[PDB]
Design an enzyme around this catalytic site. Structure first.
Site, short mmCIF file in Angstrom:
data_model
loop_
_atom_site.label_atom_id
_atom_site.label_comp_id
_atom_site.label_asym_id
_atom_site.label_seq_id
_atom_site.Cartn_x
_atom_site.Cartn_y
_atom_site.Cartn_z
N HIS B 89 89.87 6.31 46.07
CA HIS B 89 89.25 7.60 45.78
C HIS B 89 89.90 8.20 44.53
CE1 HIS B 89 87.27 7.68 49.79
NE2 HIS B 89 88.42 7.26 50.28
N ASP B 92 87.36 14.46 40.34
CA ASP B 92 86.84 14.97 39.08
C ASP B 92 86.67 16.48 39.23
OD1 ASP B 92 84.85 15.96 37.09
OD2 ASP B 92 83.42 14.49 37.68
N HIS B 129 84.66 16.82 42.78
CA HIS B 129 84.13 15.76 43.62
C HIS B 129 84.85 14.44 43.36
CE1 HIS B 129 81.46 13.75 40.53
NE2 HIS B 129 81.22 14.97 40.11
N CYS B 130 84.66 13.50 44.28
CA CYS B 130 85.30 12.19 44.05
C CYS B 130 84.38 11.34 43.20
CB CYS B 130 85.58 11.60 45.43
SG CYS B 130 86.21 9.92 45.42
N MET B 144 82.39 14.01 49.88
CA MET B 144 83.52 14.36 48.98
C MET B 144 83.25 15.29 47.84
SD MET B 144 85.73 10.83 49.19
CE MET B 144 87.22 11.81 48.87
N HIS B 249 68.79 31.86 49.88
CA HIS B 249 68.13 33.12 50.18
C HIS B 249 68.73 33.75 51.44
CE1 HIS B 249 64.64 35.78 51.04
NE2 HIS B 249 64.64 35.29 52.26
N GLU B 273 65.73 37.70 45.16
CA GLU B 273 65.31 37.37 46.52
C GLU B 273 65.87 36.01 46.87
OE1 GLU B 273 60.80 36.81 46.89
OE2 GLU B 273 60.86 36.87 44.70
N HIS B 300 65.52 28.03 50.62
CA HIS B 300 64.14 28.49 50.84
C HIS B 300 63.06 27.47 50.47
CE1 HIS B 300 60.86 31.16 51.69
NE2 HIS B 300 61.68 32.16 51.93
#
Ligand SMILES: [Cu+2]
Ligand SMILES: [Cu+2]
Ligand SMILES: [Cu+2]
Ligand SMILES: [Cu+2]
Ligand SMILES: [Cu+2]
Ligand SMILES: [Cu+2]
Lengths: 336, 336, 336
Positions: B89, B92, B129-130, B144, B249, B273, B300
């Site tokens: 792993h 970043d 993230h990985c 991840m 939303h 909204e 939504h």
């Protein structure tokens, strides 16, 4: 401002990812800028497995070349459809006003040409694409689109009105492709362009691309064909998607100043990790490189980038700056 | 501003949806903020039918914990990959500059750890993230990812520069999941993480998630696990999506001040909204509750929310205000 | 500002694409504006092949009618569900605060009616939709949604605070439809609304619409039913999508001033080629026509527009202006 009495100048177009030479801020008054583009229908190889696409292009490339003019200039385009092509084509400029973007006035059959002039009165990056009545989506997803950039006469500005300048401009066209598979699970190869139609529309209707590529094929902007820059340089990245949304990101960098809807009379947003290009539009980002190395420029739906193809590389020369990032301890055994 | 001579401070991370204690506006000068995260590969149950996911996590949760620092601070992260895990792993950070966000300097095999330091010089909510070479999308859609929030030293501001303050912050990670079905139409259960790979990539390529969940499973933020607030309180809702677009939303409420691209040097939009989080980014909204009751916080695209799982609840205590909304006549027979 | 002591006024609703008469800037003080809407479940023909949809509507149309009030006004709605309908319904206003947008206070079974009042304290275009517990997505994709427009009391303004005025307003609701196919490859026809449920939810879960239409059917806003305008007129185009994202574009024109998130306290963007409406929201654009002719107003995912149905026409009368666009040379044989 009657175009018939302005100075006329011819511009020679270059192939993506480069952009033809142009000035940013200009002291020049309005002019008629003349361009010529020739349509080319051709079969192309789009991946490393030998998959082919029955493609349709402006000037032989995907995307077509970027045209650059200044706000208040007139664009005068001659569109040529050689007799070696099989279909009729035209052009719709999103930067123009009236006649369906110019498509109603540029319907050219194989063996014909036409010339259109329009006022480029709105600044920004705009898509241009082909749009023949009854076959619009097919011509566009087969490769017929590019960008028109209309620069403000005073150049690009930040939200406080301060001047922005770029050292280099690159243009990337992202294409969602719909390549049919046969009964044996392999992609189909067609002898002619016409023969691919029927199977291709059925795939289009699923709304699921088989491939999504930058500039015509998987890996077009990688390895030997990577984009290049130097630490300290400011790059303009133009990104067009004429049919489907995309979300560009520079791994290891940012969008310093970004116009995601691509229209330069609006203030840019700063420090973006990932921006959004609406299908049917072109956007633009500026970035000043601060670290050397390889950067990946991609669509941050990572399946779309790594599985389907929408990723490219930028190779940057310069000195590493440990004040921005430093490896304190390299990977090593967990201490027991 | 040489990081080696700044004060260093260790921060203890908490599990989503809470965020570790931190100051908004701060009088403190820049510092090196130290964090440690441990990777955990584990099988998890993601719905009420018993469907399982071979998951990959930062610190055992989906999403990983939110890290909070101030602009101009340095982040110093120790990443640990225990010998009980099977894969390599890395991490970043979209908030960092260079070396593919730090991924090139944090490649840790099972049984190893590494330490990285980077300057957090841009304010906003960013994804981390990985991204292991050749398996990027799989590690990300398996869980991840998380958020790094870099607050301006002066706290959050409105478009006129007026101070904004929140009483509580919550962090929501939305995950598009790709769980394969067998020949009998039921979701597959895998004995190991490696065995799920081949079937999972085939589903990913359809671009159609089987499930879309908030914080690791259907109903994670409902009933007993609902988020809570009081009338009069201002809440900060952080929302990350590392792979796919989403459109949050608050049913019965609004986004009072929203940074949908998540970058705090830009002015927020008001009274939204529904807002839009680009895949590969994190955004943030502020809302001040004015009515008590249960609120639903959801994506939504209502199929994505109610059929596939992307919906949560906020339970708010307080007094009902009939000046904002009043039932004039309760449901009754149409008068004849 | 106690609503019980304000003047009350009844408004008569009109069918899309028109919008009921209203003032833009107003000298009038706050008032209680009363409206009545009746639900109608009915089968409708949505294309030229005879495909039917078991539809659910507010006031018999898709979308339901646009309601217009001014900021600070109260909306008072009577919702009627006749005994000829089979299902229970309600209404959620995204412009309202509390009780799940009003859905908790308007649950009406066939043969019942209810009345709700809420303060419209935020300006902009908002979606309203039906949302019965356990069947939310089905009622919405079957047609139950429309727009509430809350105008600033001083009318619309540009980013510098200059007044903007429109000559005509049109309202377009875009609907993603999920019509099931039988074993023979043809769309299914159902005798009752209830019988379509089970097959329809299975199609919804693929996230792939069979059809995407403007105002209830393919070609609703074309030919004889095209929208109309004159050169020199400024039109307000309201566009709602209660479930799925869309990206509107006017071929041959632009968005002169656009609120893509639809909230009028934020500055509009100018000169857009294509804008983005988030699923679960309504946006608005202004355009002043400068050229006569037929314009196409469409979703610029061109497969969605030309293959699935999301396209309409605007027919504009006036004089052609060769200073904005001119055919220099009509299509002719390439010179040899
Ligand atoms: Cu063409
Ligand atoms: Cu177009
Ligand atoms: Cu990993
Ligand atoms: Cu990333
Ligand atoms: Cu209903
Ligand atoms: Cu809603």
């Amino acid at each position: 401002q009657d175009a018939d009495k302005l100075p006329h100048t011819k511009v020679t177009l270059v192939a993506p990812p480069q952009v033809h030479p142009h000035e940013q801020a200009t002291k020049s008054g309005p002019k008629v800028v003349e361009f010529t583009m020739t349509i080319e229908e051709k079969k192309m190889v789009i991946d490393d497995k030998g998959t082919t696409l029955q493609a349709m292009t402006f000037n032989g490339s995907m995307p077509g070349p970027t045209l650059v003019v200044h706000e208040g200039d007139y664009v005068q385009l001659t569109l040529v459809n050689p007799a070696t092509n099989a279909m009729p084509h035209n052009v719709d400029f999103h930067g123009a006003t009236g006649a369906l973007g110019g498509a109603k006035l540029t319907n050219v059959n194989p063996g014909e040409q036409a010339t259109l002039r329009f006022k480029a009165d709105r600044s920004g990056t705009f898509v241009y694409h082909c749009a023949p009545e009854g076959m619009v989506p097919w011509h566009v997803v087969s490769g017929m689109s590019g960008t028109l950039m209309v620069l403000p006469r005073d150049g690009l500005k930040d939200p406080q009105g301060k001047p922005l300048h770029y050292d280099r401009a690159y243009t990337i066209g992202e294409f969602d492709l719909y390549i049919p598979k046969g009964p044996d699970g392999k992609y189909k190869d067609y002898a002619t362009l016409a023969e691919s139609y029927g199977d291709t529309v059925q795939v289009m209707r699923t709304l699921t691309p088989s491939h999504i590529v930058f500039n015509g094929k998987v890996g077009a902007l990688t390895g030997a064909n990577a984009l290049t820059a130097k630490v300290g340089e400011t790059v303009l990245l133009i990104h067009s998607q004429a049919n489907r949304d995309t979300r560009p990101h520079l791994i290891g960098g940012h969008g310093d100043w970004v116009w995601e809807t691509g229209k330069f009379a609006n203030p840019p947003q700063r420090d973006l990790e990932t921006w959004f290009i609406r299908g049917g539009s072109a956007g633009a980002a500026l970035y000043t490189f601060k670290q050397p190395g390889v950067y990946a420029y991609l669509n941050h739906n990572l399946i779309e980038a790594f599985e389907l193809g929408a990723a490219g590389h930028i190779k940057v020369e310069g000195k590493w700056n440990d004040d921005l990032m430093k490896q304190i301890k390299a990977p090593a055994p967990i201490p027991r």
